[PDB]
Design a protein around this ligand. Sequence first.
Ligand SMILES: [Fe+3]
Ligand SMILES: [Fe+3]
Lengths: 317, 317
Amino acid sequence: TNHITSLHHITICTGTAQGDIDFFVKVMGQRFVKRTLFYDGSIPIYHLYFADELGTPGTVMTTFPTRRTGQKGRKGSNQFTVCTYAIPKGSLEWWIGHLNAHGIATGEPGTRFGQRYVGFQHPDCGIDFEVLEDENDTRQPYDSPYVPIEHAQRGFHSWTASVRELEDMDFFMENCWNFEKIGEEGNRHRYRVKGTTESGTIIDLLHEPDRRQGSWTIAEGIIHHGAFAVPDMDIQARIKFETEGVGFTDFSDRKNRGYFESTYVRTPGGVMFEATHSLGFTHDEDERSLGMDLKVSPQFDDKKHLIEQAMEDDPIV
Amino acid sequence: TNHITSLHHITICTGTAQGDIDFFVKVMGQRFVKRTLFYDGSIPIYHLYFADELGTPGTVMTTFPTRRTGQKGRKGSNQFTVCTYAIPKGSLEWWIGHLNAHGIATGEPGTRFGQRYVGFQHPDCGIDFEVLEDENDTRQPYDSPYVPIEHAQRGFHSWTASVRELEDMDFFMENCWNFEKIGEEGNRHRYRVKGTTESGTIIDLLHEPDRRQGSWTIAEGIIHHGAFAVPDMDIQARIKFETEGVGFTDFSDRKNRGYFESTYVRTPGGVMFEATHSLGFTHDEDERSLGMDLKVSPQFDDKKHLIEQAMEDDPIV
Ligand SMILES: [Fe+3]
Ligand SMILES: [Fe+3]
């Protein structure tokens, strides 16, 4: 195949680094697979990665703990609003259990397209999550402590985008982005990668024309963008060219973000999309010891003291 | 100075090429300064340029006659909606006159921030224009036939953008784009290049949260983007970096568009902005004979017959 294939990673702005470890590792049972430090013009900021065992597309979660900038983002309508993990069928109560046990309030369990889910928030920034019973998801769960292999989530089921302009967003998914509407209930419209069988291939659009646009900038409490897996850099370039061709001339240059190749476009629904080529997480760290070594970026050669600043104010354990 | 300095060009999708010549040259009294042919994946499409004598920033108008694609764009709320020329004071009636004479209906003359204007449409696609009496505009009018030098427009006064999200758009103008709010009347908020004295430095934002978003894609009847003059490619790159830094990672690669260097970003108001470096219109054509030679692009080497297709169905006289 030669177009975007599935979801790849999602990227959110959170509070403290320890907040995320406590949540993504100790609560969700994901492996801490990479940690990096970059300089954002003012202060050092972590870029943390969380996935299954080896950072496979459709399970990767990336975070910028951004409590140390004053910026607090506004939940709103032109952004991703909810990230949804797939858990095995029958596992909801255990999750409600091992979530409440951790002090994380959960909400009214529901059904969405026939499958059960419950919502809850990242304790340290407010971002919205769900666990959803997918009997059709056969992906290998990562075996951590914290969560037994019987009940482990096995990657992302779907992401939910709030959008004010639905018609033109639908056009973009079908014509530029290799998705097709596969369902609709209420104001929720569900799109799936054309052809696919794998899980982690679902984007739900919430039509909310009424609602004020959310924050687009890097600020605490927000999902900054969603990324989609593309087989290689050629398909990437082609998607960029044809998408520019129809008018989205804001398709970015290809950026190396460490462990993947990224191009960014602002869709007519107001949501940043990424077309991503995968680089792996092992090329600079031992498989057995992922997430232990802090990869600090070359901008710190002149200001090493800031590394020490990040380690104590945003401590990682 | 080392930031964006003024307006540069505006780029609109129109009907037929003859439509634009009849309008921009024969009605507005602008010089036809360049004409090019490119291939858009389906059909040949002109890219026409209209300005003062030598294509100076703040007077350049570019058009894609797009009647030959079926696509008809939707006027709406996340786009540029009105382009405004500056005419001398006392000249409004002559214009109302030489516009009506040409069959172009004009509307209720008005006053905006103390200055008089009248609206009217491109006869061949529907796009909205204004002439506005600016006694403070001292730029050299181009001396065409069609319009006497006494009454000639001397460039763009302002552009008017409709936007649903005003607050975050204001933030973007001040913090990334070197503009500052200088006035407000009703739902019109006026921004001007920080510091400037020159004319052609004004962007008016119309706050319209109620209104459905317009078309973003290349389609007849729409303004696709506005471009802003930047002194050189270094300032350009810096603006790209700092703007990406706060979250607009969709800032495009620098593209050579023939007669200028362009980078594109989708602002939080939903409007495409360009940071433009100028290349001039003479580097490939004689000053005395601008707009006479059709510069066809290298994509036509394999399909020369399409050049002949454009010349007769979109004839230029
Ligand atoms: Fe990304
Ligand atoms: Fe442009």
